[PDB]
Amino acid sequence: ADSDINIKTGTTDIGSNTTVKTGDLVTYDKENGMHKKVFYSFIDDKNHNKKLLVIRTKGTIAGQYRVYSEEGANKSGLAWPSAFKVQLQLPDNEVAQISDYYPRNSIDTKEYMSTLTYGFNGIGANVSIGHTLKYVQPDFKTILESPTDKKVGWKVIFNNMVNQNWGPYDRDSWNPVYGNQLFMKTRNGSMKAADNFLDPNKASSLLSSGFSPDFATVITMDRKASKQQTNIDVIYERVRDDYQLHWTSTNWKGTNTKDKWTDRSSERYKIDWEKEEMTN
Amino acid sequence: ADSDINIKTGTTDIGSNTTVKTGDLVTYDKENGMHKKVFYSFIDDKNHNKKLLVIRTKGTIAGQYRVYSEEGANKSGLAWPSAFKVQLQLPDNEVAQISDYYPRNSIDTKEYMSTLTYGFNGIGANVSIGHTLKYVQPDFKTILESPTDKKVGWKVIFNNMVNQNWGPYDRDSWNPVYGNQLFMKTRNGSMKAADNFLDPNKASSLLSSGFSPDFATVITMDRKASKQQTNIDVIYERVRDDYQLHWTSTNWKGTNTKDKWTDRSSERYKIDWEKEEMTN
Amino acid sequence: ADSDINIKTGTTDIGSNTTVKTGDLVTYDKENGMHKKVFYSFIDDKNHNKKLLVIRTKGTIAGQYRVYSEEGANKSGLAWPSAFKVQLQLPDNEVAQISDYYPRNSIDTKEYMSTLTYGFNGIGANVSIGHTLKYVQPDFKTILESPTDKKVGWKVIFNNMVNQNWGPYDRDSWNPVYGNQLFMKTRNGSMKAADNFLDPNKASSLLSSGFSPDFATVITMDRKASKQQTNIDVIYERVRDDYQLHWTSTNWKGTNTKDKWTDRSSERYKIDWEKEEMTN
Amino acid sequence: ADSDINIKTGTTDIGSNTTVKTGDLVTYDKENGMHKKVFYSFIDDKNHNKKLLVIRTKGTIAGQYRVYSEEGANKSGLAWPSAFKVQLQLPDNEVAQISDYYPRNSIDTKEYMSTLTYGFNGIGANVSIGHTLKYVQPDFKTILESPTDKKVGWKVIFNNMVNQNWGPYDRDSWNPVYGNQLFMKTRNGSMKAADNFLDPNKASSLLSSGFSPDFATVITMDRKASKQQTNIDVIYERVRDDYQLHWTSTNWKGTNTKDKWTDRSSERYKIDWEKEEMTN
Amino acid sequence: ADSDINIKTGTTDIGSNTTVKTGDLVTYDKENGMHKKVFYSFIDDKNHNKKLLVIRTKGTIAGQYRVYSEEGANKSGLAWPSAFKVQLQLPDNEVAQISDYYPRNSIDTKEYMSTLTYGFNGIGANVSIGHTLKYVQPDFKTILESPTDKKVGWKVIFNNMVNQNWGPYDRDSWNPVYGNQLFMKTRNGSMKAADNFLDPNKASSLLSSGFSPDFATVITMDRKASKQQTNIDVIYERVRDDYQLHWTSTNWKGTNTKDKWTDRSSERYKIDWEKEEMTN
Amino acid sequence: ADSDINIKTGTTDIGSNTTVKTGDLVTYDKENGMHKKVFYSFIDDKNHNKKLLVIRTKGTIAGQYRVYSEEGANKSGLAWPSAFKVQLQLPDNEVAQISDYYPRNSIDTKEYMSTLTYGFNGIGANVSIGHTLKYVQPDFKTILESPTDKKVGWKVIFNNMVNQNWGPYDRDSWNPVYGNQLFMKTRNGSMKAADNFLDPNKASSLLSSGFSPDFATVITMDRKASKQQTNIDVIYERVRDDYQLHWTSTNWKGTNTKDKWTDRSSERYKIDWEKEEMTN
Amino acid sequence: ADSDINIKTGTTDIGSNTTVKTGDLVTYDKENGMHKKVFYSFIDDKNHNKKLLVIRTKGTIAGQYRVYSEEGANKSGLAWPSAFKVQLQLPDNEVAQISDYYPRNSIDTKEYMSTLTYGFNGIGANVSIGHTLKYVQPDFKTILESPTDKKVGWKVIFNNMVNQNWGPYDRDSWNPVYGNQLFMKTRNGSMKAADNFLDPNKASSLLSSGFSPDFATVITMDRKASKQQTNIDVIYERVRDDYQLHWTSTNWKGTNTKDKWTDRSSERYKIDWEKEEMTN
């Protein structure tokens, strides 16, 4: 990157011969089960024209993958985490601005391969033409939602998942006989409906054991501001889907309803640029 | 590179024993949704024969992928980002020149594989000849548009995309029955036209959540110039295509029109070589 | 990571120009066979706003894979480690909090590949459409169980295993003739039941020779706390399953019962923040 | 390399405890569209027996890929860059010599794979023998033209290119019906000839957006020379081919004519070894 | 690892600003052919709460692969190393404890790939379903036998081996006609039995030329112990199997008997913590 | 390597706290077209028991790939570089000895893969057995010719090359109809013989644009020698083959004659150990 | 390795703050063609309890691949290097011991892949079961022969080689018609027998151009020994096989005889521990 322009590596980076005052702030939201942690760092270079503060948004958002209700032996439900989110808003009153962020959106790729085979038999001359196309498919996608001057947020959505080494299924799949078989343990099962869901160990880890963010947003403030103090709000949330499965007198049929419940955990932090410390 | 010519690594690089004065300038263009950020750095070596200034053109250009209009239940439209651009012009009056830039155009590659198989049967001797050819295909292509002494620009164009694990489609594809099926959720669908488009999560990330540049241009100025001050214009823009789909009484047909709307966000920055700071 | 935001590498890390007081505490639980070791480290930065203590939870939990009982020459049993666990609780009375942890849950991935081949014969034109999907399957899965403010734990569960280069079997597999053949040496064997189990060398190493953790939890304490002293409990445990196999007068049939025995080894450690040492 | 002869790494390299005087010289040739840049560096070791000067020949040679003329709706032309060149001559009068250069010619490689399969059928015993051979094919080849004492040059030639995921075509390909279909958008097209060429985005990047060199030549001069001053000429150039396509009343036929136009941009730089600076 | 918790790399490691007193102790056991070497190191940190001593158990255990006896031209034997072992016991009287060890047990992995291809013929519609599963198989497995407070040991067992590019054979393989053909040079051979064994070069290297360990165990002692002196025993051993092959008047039949001979080489070393040296 | 024997990396290397006197000597042989360059370095350690001098034999040997003569429209010839050589002789009178050299001969490798597939049909049980074997084949091979005390040399020979994505032809290939088709553009061509050779761009780069060595030989001299002065001869050379092709009234036939012309460029350099400089 | 036990990297290594006295000793054995070179190094740590001396056994053993005799036009011979060896003996009188050595024996690996495919036809249900197994095969194997207290040696043996892209042949292969065809240029050839051998360029490099060792043995001596002086013998050797081929009036038949000639080059070096130098 920088070395390709004949500039020495690390020349244009910042933070040299200066003292960062790091920190840590841990919260637990027992109502929603969101361990929260806001590691920060106040980088003050005399060369840089603005102060800096990198906010690491570590933590954990618990999956909460469980059978929420059952109605007899022919109907049951399941609530699973459809998407995890982490937002970092900043009041429009304040004059500090978000400078950068990481991770960011990346461009996909796919391999395309084509064939052309023709042979002869001892005359049955044949010709064969074919093309194949391959690409990788993560179970969960870390999308950086579009940022602005005061707001930046991420989300992790549910791409698709392979159910007992059989089919990549997604929230939109539909099969006329069996319905959406995303978390259906057995098709022609004879057990109670409440006990015919995929074992959470068999599923992805993020579904039941939760997703632990690692995100960064550096915010810069003018060095001659009238007041050196800005509050910030950071919001965690998860969106859960209702997966119902019931018996049609011949086989199980499963249906999925998108974005059934969403629970937000919001915390407000006050930043003190002069003291170089921000508090709960 | 440098070590292959028996020269010690880093000998010919610049920026040693000198003080770069970095900086940062953040703007948000709420009309067009273009977060903008112009991290810069003034590298002054006494060995180098000209002053330097590397301009990092970070930011984010929001995707803006949405159904702009609907006309009944048999016609609808879609505006999607065909190409993102970043230009960095310099007035022809000024005597500063762009020195380098990164990234730059790179040479493609493809693998070619050939076969020759002949067998016998217990006599039906056969012969088979075939050749295969494979290469990777990014969804978006980062082309460095041809630079000049005062102007350098990049663009990120739409190569092609795989629609529900079925076919790489591009802006030019055409199928006599269905038309261009780039973002067509269902072929023989029975839903409202406005609700028959590919879900933005299913698409590429850059389409809906935006593209965040990371580009660099070092500009050099003569050290004995009469006036040590030059203004610069940096332009962001995105080009949107209109994707229309309608019902032909039997199946959906979709058409794509290229370069329908383009919105430019231009900002002018004044550079002060003597003070080593450039302002909004 | 940090270098992508133009910050110099290692700027925002902690532990510079400070003296960590490391340590070590080894215990052996001969009743359950759990070698235990709690390497710790007291990192005190004057810049950081809280004290730190990283707790490495190394050790070893022995596999204990053996034939626990035999009942004649037509019935026998096997106890094998279904899952190893490591928990690190903290009394809710104390004001120290767990800050971070490693390893953490990671997002899976799978490759999807599609084909489309059509040929001609000398006319028998054919068409072939196919898709393949591949992914890796570890024998044991290291899941980070959902953490909280005072409690963090991991577990290592049994995914599946390939029995004599023949089939990946798991705890839930069932075959109507042979039953669950997870550890069945021979199908139509004629030996004693006690001597018809898979040789422990042929199995995975973790089944018989044990699993040695390597986990980390940093806990932070407020620097102006009223009392600088907190005790901690760390718990190891393994969960064993009963694998029974018997003769049906024609072939062996094997059945597996989940979570038969669980044995916990709990130890309490007292931390002294002022002295920077924690004792057994 | 050097470490394999038991010599410490970097022992035999040069440039230690010395001061290189780097530089930069930017030119733009608006007639031919060749951004030009001659980053240099004067490495003077007291241990080395000759002075050094590494000349980096960065820049950009614009592709110039456009329809130069059209003659009705049944005939048109296209001029595309067949080869980019960069030469660095030195007058035979001068006593400075080119010492090294980079990149240099490299030896190709190919994988050879052989098969021998024989089977039986329930007796139709068969035998199958086959061999496959694979290798990579860059679109453009960077050949170091043979250097001499006073002259060194590179060139980047057109290997071949895949046209709409169909066939690797080169300048020499010929098909009796369609002719050379290197840049033919459609075979049985019905559009104007001027609008039946491959879209420049679909082509390689180097064709339309240009090629940016990165080459190095260190030249050494005797330290006791009578005059410490030598001028140098550096030449850029591109070679364009005329691609004509016309209608044969049934389908398009395309023909390519090699080395139609070549445009050279020559600049002369005067080197001053005593002052350690070279000027435009 | 450590850098992921925002701690600077190497902060929590030990051995800074201290003087380790290394050493070396070489023994040769000509009766059993076991070159033995116990490189050690006394790491004394004033920060660490216990003294350290890392014991490297290098050496070599000769394979001893030879025809031990022959009984005519129709019967012969072979003794080959079934498993090499290295144990490091510590008397239960002493108060020093083994702290860590390396290498340790690792979790296996396997790739699972599934297919689903259906085509049509010009109607003979077919469907094809298949799954493949691949994994690597070392010839010898380095198992860490379960350690305790006073005892830690490793072993290297014989997984399986490919006999003349034909079949992966193991100690348990059986073929009703030929028996266990693990080291059988020819099936329908006509040579003397003593000369019908696989050439030791064709086999694995570890069988005939021996296995050289590289293992480490750090043992820690309380710093205020009453007596600073502990003796240690380190045991090498190899287990040899008897592979017999004889003529059945039509073809060779070979049988393998497990764990026939085991030879142990035990040495006792006295550690002097105060002097920081341990002797033979 | 060195770190595996518990010795610190770089401990046993040489060249510490000493001053190497490097240099450079460039020659051009316009008669044979061999750019020549003899970068050297005088490493004098007071610990080492002998002086050192590493001789880098860089340069370039031009390919000289051209049609040397033509005899009508039915016969022509071609001279191409069969092998490049670089020798570094030392008079047997002198007492300096060559110490090491790089590159050196390396051991090849090949992958062997075997199959065993048997299926059933609905009974036509079949069995299939096959084995495949693959390895890479460089176009030119860099063989270190066997060195001695006073003479060391390398050579680069012509392995084989793929002619227009068709067949790996070599110098020894023969086809009864067409002869050796190594550089035959067209089989049933109708052009002049002089214009029926493979285009030099289509061939390997080393054939026409030349091969640039990078070789090293350290020579050591006794420190108490009677005379501290030795001359050295370094020889470049290329061997050219005559490739003739002529018309047999039906198709072209090509023949290759091995080692037709060889041209040597020899230079003598005088080394002065006391002054630490060697001259042309 | 060392960093996994929480010890800082390089803590337990040796050679810090000490002065190694390296050296070099070159010999050429013109009778056997064995360039010999014994780079050494005397590492004296005050922490280490014994002196050290690492002996690098570089050099070159010429291949000597030539037709030794011919008997008419129907019989000829070939002597080729079957195995190269390097031994480093130490008199049993001396009290110095070999401490370590490198390289050492390594454990092989192989990939096992299994398939299970069953399809249906439009009913001809079929089932297919197959397994494949792959591994790499070096041409020459570097086996560390079993070391002892006073003697350590290596050898490089001939694994197998592919003859004109046709079959991997070894010294033991036999074909009833053609015999061992290891170096047989043509089967139904009509040339003189002396000119029907594989061209040495077509063979492996080690056969004709020689094998250059790179081996290390550190020997340690007690620091309070009565006499600080030990002599050492280092032996090179190569073993040559006689490959005869003759005409059977229909086709060539070739036979190989193992270990025909062996030539040893022995040199004795006297080590002076007090002076830290060893002489020829």
PDB file of N, CA and C in Angstrom, chain C residues 13-14 20 22-24 28 35 37 59-60 104 125-127 129-135 137 139 165 205 209, chain E residues 4-6 8 11 14 49 99 101 105 107-108 110-116 118-120 122 135 137 143-144 148:
ATOM      1  N   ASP C  13      -2.777  -0.878  21.724  1.00  0.00           N
ATOM      2  CA  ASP C  13      -2.573  -1.988  22.640  1.00  0.00           C
ATOM      3  C   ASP C  13      -2.107  -1.469  23.999  1.00  0.00           C
ATOM      4  N   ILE C  14      -2.139  -2.351  24.997  1.00  0.00           N
ATOM      5  CA  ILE C  14      -1.782  -1.969  26.360  1.00  0.00           C
ATOM      6  C   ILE C  14      -0.601  -2.797  26.852  1.00  0.00           C
ATOM      7  N   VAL C  20       4.466  -6.629  34.408  1.00  0.00           N
ATOM      8  CA  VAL C  20       3.505  -7.678  34.726  1.00  0.00           C
ATOM      9  C   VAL C  20       4.146  -8.642  35.715  1.00  0.00           C
ATOM     10  N   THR C  22       3.733 -12.259  36.602  1.00  0.00           N
ATOM     11  CA  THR C  22       3.110 -13.499  36.163  1.00  0.00           C
ATOM     12  C   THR C  22       3.114 -14.502  37.311  1.00  0.00           C
ATOM     13  N   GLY C  23       2.646 -15.713  37.044  1.00  0.00           N
ATOM     14  CA  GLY C  23       2.565 -16.713  38.085  1.00  0.00           C
ATOM     15  C   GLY C  23       2.149 -18.047  37.516  1.00  0.00           C
ATOM     16  N   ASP C  24       1.895 -18.993  38.413  1.00  0.00           N
ATOM     17  CA  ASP C  24       1.548 -20.342  37.994  1.00  0.00           C
ATOM     18  C   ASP C  24       0.998 -21.100  39.189  1.00  0.00           C
ATOM     19  N   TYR C  28      -3.618 -31.288  40.738  1.00  0.00           N
ATOM     20  CA  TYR C  28      -4.003 -32.547  40.121  1.00  0.00           C
ATOM     21  C   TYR C  28      -5.119 -33.173  40.935  1.00  0.00           C
ATOM     22  N   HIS C  35      -5.630 -32.832  35.378  1.00  0.00           N
ATOM     23  CA  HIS C  35      -4.504 -31.935  35.592  1.00  0.00           C
ATOM     24  C   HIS C  35      -4.947 -30.502  35.347  1.00  0.00           C
ATOM     25  N   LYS C  37      -4.128 -26.142  35.755  1.00  0.00           N
ATOM     26  CA  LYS C  37      -3.035 -25.169  35.746  1.00  0.00           C
ATOM     27  C   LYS C  37      -3.583 -23.809  35.350  1.00  0.00           C
ATOM     28  N   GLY C  59      -4.197 -26.947  31.143  1.00  0.00           N
ATOM     29  CA  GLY C  59      -4.341 -28.138  31.949  1.00  0.00           C
ATOM     30  C   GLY C  59      -4.486 -29.356  31.059  1.00  0.00           C
ATOM     31  N   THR C  60      -5.274 -30.315  31.539  1.00  0.00           N
ATOM     32  CA  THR C  60      -5.612 -31.506  30.772  1.00  0.00           C
ATOM     33  C   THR C  60      -6.750 -32.231  31.471  1.00  0.00           C
ATOM     34  N   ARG C 104     -13.318 -17.412  20.644  1.00  0.00           N
ATOM     35  CA  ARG C 104     -14.717 -17.036  20.555  1.00  0.00           C
ATOM     36  C   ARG C 104     -15.363 -17.725  19.364  1.00  0.00           C
ATOM     37  N   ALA C 125     -29.211 -35.446 -28.318  1.00  0.00           N
ATOM     38  CA  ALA C 125     -28.803 -34.325 -27.484  1.00  0.00           C
ATOM     39  C   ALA C 125     -29.249 -34.543 -26.045  1.00  0.00           C
ATOM     40  N   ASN C 126     -28.312 -34.434 -25.109  1.00  0.00           N
ATOM     41  CA  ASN C 126     -28.583 -34.562 -23.685  1.00  0.00           C
ATOM     42  C   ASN C 126     -28.281 -33.253 -22.966  1.00  0.00           C
ATOM     43  N   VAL C 127     -28.764 -33.157 -21.730  1.00  0.00           N
ATOM     44  CA  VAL C 127     -28.511 -32.015 -20.858  1.00  0.00           C
ATOM     45  C   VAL C 127     -28.282 -32.536 -19.450  1.00  0.00           C
ATOM     46  N   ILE C 129     -27.431 -31.217 -15.374  1.00  0.00           N
ATOM     47  CA  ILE C 129     -27.397 -30.123 -14.412  1.00  0.00           C
ATOM     48  C   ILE C 129     -27.092 -30.702 -13.041  1.00  0.00           C
ATOM     49  N   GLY C 130     -26.103 -30.144 -12.359  1.00  0.00           N
ATOM     50  CA  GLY C 130     -25.703 -30.676 -11.067  1.00  0.00           C
ATOM     51  C   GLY C 130     -25.079 -29.607 -10.207  1.00  0.00           C
ATOM     52  N   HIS C 131     -25.100 -29.832  -8.892  1.00  0.00           N
ATOM     53  CA  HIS C 131     -24.477 -28.914  -7.951  1.00  0.00           C
ATOM     54  C   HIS C 131     -23.861 -29.687  -6.795  1.00  0.00           C
ATOM     55  N   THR C 132     -22.679 -29.254  -6.363  1.00  0.00           N
ATOM     56  CA  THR C 132     -21.961 -29.879  -5.261  1.00  0.00           C
ATOM     57  C   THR C 132     -21.678 -28.852  -4.178  1.00  0.00           C
ATOM     58  N   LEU C 133     -21.526 -29.327  -2.945  1.00  0.00           N
ATOM     59  CA  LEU C 133     -21.391 -28.452  -1.791  1.00  0.00           C
ATOM     60  C   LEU C 133     -20.481 -29.110  -0.766  1.00  0.00           C
ATOM     61  N   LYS C 134     -19.397 -28.433  -0.387  1.00  0.00           N
ATOM     62  CA  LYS C 134     -18.369 -29.036   0.451  1.00  0.00           C
ATOM     63  C   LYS C 134     -17.990 -28.121   1.604  1.00  0.00           C
ATOM     64  N   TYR C 135     -17.553 -28.737   2.699  1.00  0.00           N
ATOM     65  CA  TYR C 135     -17.248 -28.042   3.941  1.00  0.00           C
ATOM     66  C   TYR C 135     -16.506 -29.009   4.852  1.00  0.00           C
ATOM     67  N   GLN C 137     -15.369 -30.681   8.610  1.00  0.00           N
ATOM     68  CA  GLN C 137     -16.083 -31.152   9.795  1.00  0.00           C
ATOM     69  C   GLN C 137     -15.101 -31.588  10.872  1.00  0.00           C
ATOM     70  N   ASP C 139     -13.686 -33.074  14.331  1.00  0.00           N
ATOM     71  CA  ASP C 139     -14.193 -34.151  15.179  1.00  0.00           C
ATOM     72  C   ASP C 139     -14.810 -33.613  16.462  1.00  0.00           C
ATOM     73  N   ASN C 165     -12.427 -45.932   8.384  1.00  0.00           N
ATOM     74  CA  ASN C 165     -12.512 -45.415   7.021  1.00  0.00           C
ATOM     75  C   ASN C 165     -13.854 -45.768   6.385  1.00  0.00           C
ATOM     76  N   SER C 205      -7.772 -39.006  19.198  1.00  0.00           N
ATOM     77  CA  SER C 205      -6.888 -38.928  20.354  1.00  0.00           C
ATOM     78  C   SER C 205      -7.619 -38.411  21.584  1.00  0.00           C
ATOM     79  N   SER C 209      -6.905 -40.225  25.315  1.00  0.00           N
ATOM     80  CA  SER C 209      -5.737 -39.575  25.892  1.00  0.00           C
ATOM     81  C   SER C 209      -6.018 -38.197  26.476  1.00  0.00           C
TER      82      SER C 209
ATOM     83  N   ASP E   4      -5.052 -10.555  20.425  1.00  0.00           N
ATOM     84  CA  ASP E   4      -6.480 -10.407  20.190  1.00  0.00           C
ATOM     85  C   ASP E   4      -7.207  -9.816  21.389  1.00  0.00           C
ATOM     86  N   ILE E   5      -6.588  -9.833  22.565  1.00  0.00           N
ATOM     87  CA  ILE E   5      -7.218  -9.322  23.775  1.00  0.00           C
ATOM     88  C   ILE E   5      -6.738  -7.899  24.029  1.00  0.00           C
ATOM     89  N   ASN E   6      -6.195  -7.261  22.991  1.00  0.00           N
ATOM     90  CA  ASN E   6      -5.664  -5.899  23.011  1.00  0.00           C
ATOM     91  C   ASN E   6      -4.408  -5.770  23.858  1.00  0.00           C
ATOM     92  N   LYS E   8      -0.417  -6.131  24.319  1.00  0.00           N
ATOM     93  CA  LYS E   8       0.741  -6.132  23.436  1.00  0.00           C
ATOM     94  C   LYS E   8       1.367  -7.521  23.384  1.00  0.00           C
ATOM     95  N   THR E  11       3.696  -9.480  26.163  1.00  0.00           N
ATOM     96  CA  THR E  11       3.576  -8.876  27.485  1.00  0.00           C
ATOM     97  C   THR E  11       3.482  -9.939  28.572  1.00  0.00           C
ATOM     98  N   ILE E  14       7.215 -14.902  29.749  1.00  0.00           N
ATOM     99  CA  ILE E  14       8.182 -14.818  30.838  1.00  0.00           C
ATOM    100  C   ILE E  14       9.602 -14.937  30.297  1.00  0.00           C
ATOM    101  N   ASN E  49       6.393 -16.416  40.155  1.00  0.00           N
ATOM    102  CA  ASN E  49       6.279 -16.849  41.538  1.00  0.00           C
ATOM    103  C   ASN E  49       6.908 -18.209  41.800  1.00  0.00           C
ATOM    104  N   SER E  99       4.670 -28.446  34.974  1.00  0.00           N
ATOM    105  CA  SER E  99       3.809 -27.307  34.715  1.00  0.00           C
ATOM    106  C   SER E  99       3.101 -27.427  33.372  1.00  0.00           C
ATOM    107  N   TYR E 101       3.712 -28.857  28.899  1.00  0.00           N
ATOM    108  CA  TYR E 101       4.257 -29.877  28.018  1.00  0.00           C
ATOM    109  C   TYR E 101       3.879 -29.522  26.591  1.00  0.00           C
ATOM    110  N   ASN E 105      -2.315 -33.110  22.362  1.00  0.00           N
ATOM    111  CA  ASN E 105      -3.315 -33.685  21.478  1.00  0.00           C
ATOM    112  C   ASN E 105      -4.036 -32.602  20.689  1.00  0.00           C
ATOM    113  N   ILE E 107      -7.121 -31.766  17.530  1.00  0.00           N
ATOM    114  CA  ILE E 107      -8.407 -32.235  17.027  1.00  0.00           C
ATOM    115  C   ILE E 107      -8.305 -32.469  15.525  1.00  0.00           C
ATOM    116  N   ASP E 108      -8.777 -33.629  15.075  1.00  0.00           N
ATOM    117  CA  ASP E 108      -8.706 -33.988  13.666  1.00  0.00           C
ATOM    118  C   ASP E 108      -9.717 -33.177  12.858  1.00  0.00           C
ATOM    119  N   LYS E 110     -11.938 -33.407   8.740  1.00  0.00           N
ATOM    120  CA  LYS E 110     -12.212 -34.142   7.516  1.00  0.00           C
ATOM    121  C   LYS E 110     -13.110 -33.288   6.639  1.00  0.00           C
ATOM    122  N   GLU E 111     -12.937 -33.401   5.330  1.00  0.00           N
ATOM    123  CA  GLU E 111     -13.760 -32.673   4.379  1.00  0.00           C
ATOM    124  C   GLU E 111     -14.896 -33.554   3.895  1.00  0.00           C
ATOM    125  N   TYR E 112     -16.100 -33.001   3.877  1.00  0.00           N
ATOM    126  CA  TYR E 112     -17.275 -33.711   3.402  1.00  0.00           C
ATOM    127  C   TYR E 112     -17.822 -32.980   2.191  1.00  0.00           C
ATOM    128  N   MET E 113     -18.035 -33.709   1.103  1.00  0.00           N
ATOM    129  CA  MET E 113     -18.492 -33.134  -0.150  1.00  0.00           C
ATOM    130  C   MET E 113     -19.652 -33.953  -0.687  1.00  0.00           C
ATOM    131  N   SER E 114     -20.729 -33.281  -1.084  1.00  0.00           N
ATOM    132  CA  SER E 114     -21.938 -33.954  -1.534  1.00  0.00           C
ATOM    133  C   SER E 114     -22.304 -33.484  -2.930  1.00  0.00           C
ATOM    134  N   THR E 115     -22.950 -34.356  -3.689  1.00  0.00           N
ATOM    135  CA  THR E 115     -23.281 -34.094  -5.078  1.00  0.00           C
ATOM    136  C   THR E 115     -24.753 -34.390  -5.305  1.00  0.00           C
ATOM    137  N   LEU E 116     -25.318 -33.760  -6.332  1.00  0.00           N
ATOM    138  CA  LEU E 116     -26.687 -34.034  -6.762  1.00  0.00           C
ATOM    139  C   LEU E 116     -26.768 -33.645  -8.234  1.00  0.00           C
ATOM    140  N   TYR E 118     -28.683 -34.438 -11.972  1.00  0.00           N
ATOM    141  CA  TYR E 118     -29.749 -35.066 -12.736  1.00  0.00           C
ATOM    142  C   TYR E 118     -29.740 -34.529 -14.155  1.00  0.00           C
ATOM    143  N   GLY E 119     -29.869 -35.439 -15.119  1.00  0.00           N
ATOM    144  CA  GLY E 119     -29.800 -35.093 -16.521  1.00  0.00           C
ATOM    145  C   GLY E 119     -30.931 -35.724 -17.312  1.00  0.00           C
ATOM    146  N   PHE E 120     -30.929 -35.432 -18.606  1.00  0.00           N
ATOM    147  CA  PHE E 120     -31.940 -35.918 -19.527  1.00  0.00           C
ATOM    148  C   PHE E 120     -31.260 -36.390 -20.800  1.00  0.00           C
ATOM    149  N   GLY E 122     -31.782 -37.573 -25.047  1.00  0.00           N
ATOM    150  CA  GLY E 122     -32.607 -37.485 -26.229  1.00  0.00           C
ATOM    151  C   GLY E 122     -32.364 -38.641 -27.172  1.00  0.00           C
ATOM    152  N   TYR E 135      -9.517 -37.151   4.133  1.00  0.00           N
ATOM    153  CA  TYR E 135      -8.765 -36.823   5.335  1.00  0.00           C
ATOM    154  C   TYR E 135      -7.379 -37.437   5.207  1.00  0.00           C
ATOM    155  N   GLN E 137      -3.759 -39.191   6.611  1.00  0.00           N
ATOM    156  CA  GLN E 137      -3.428 -40.306   7.495  1.00  0.00           C
ATOM    157  C   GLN E 137      -1.922 -40.417   7.678  1.00  0.00           C
ATOM    158  N   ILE E 143       0.923 -39.373  19.962  1.00  0.00           N
ATOM    159  CA  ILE E 143      -0.104 -39.202  20.980  1.00  0.00           C
ATOM    160  C   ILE E 143       0.553 -38.753  22.275  1.00  0.00           C
ATOM    161  N   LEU E 144       0.038 -37.683  22.873  1.00  0.00           N
ATOM    162  CA  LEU E 144       0.432 -37.308  24.226  1.00  0.00           C
ATOM    163  C   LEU E 144      -0.391 -38.145  25.189  1.00  0.00           C
ATOM    164  N   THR E 148      -0.075 -36.242  34.394  1.00  0.00           N
ATOM    165  CA  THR E 148      -0.523 -36.029  35.762  1.00  0.00           C
ATOM    166  C   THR E 148       0.397 -34.997  36.401  1.00  0.00           C
TER     167      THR E 148
END
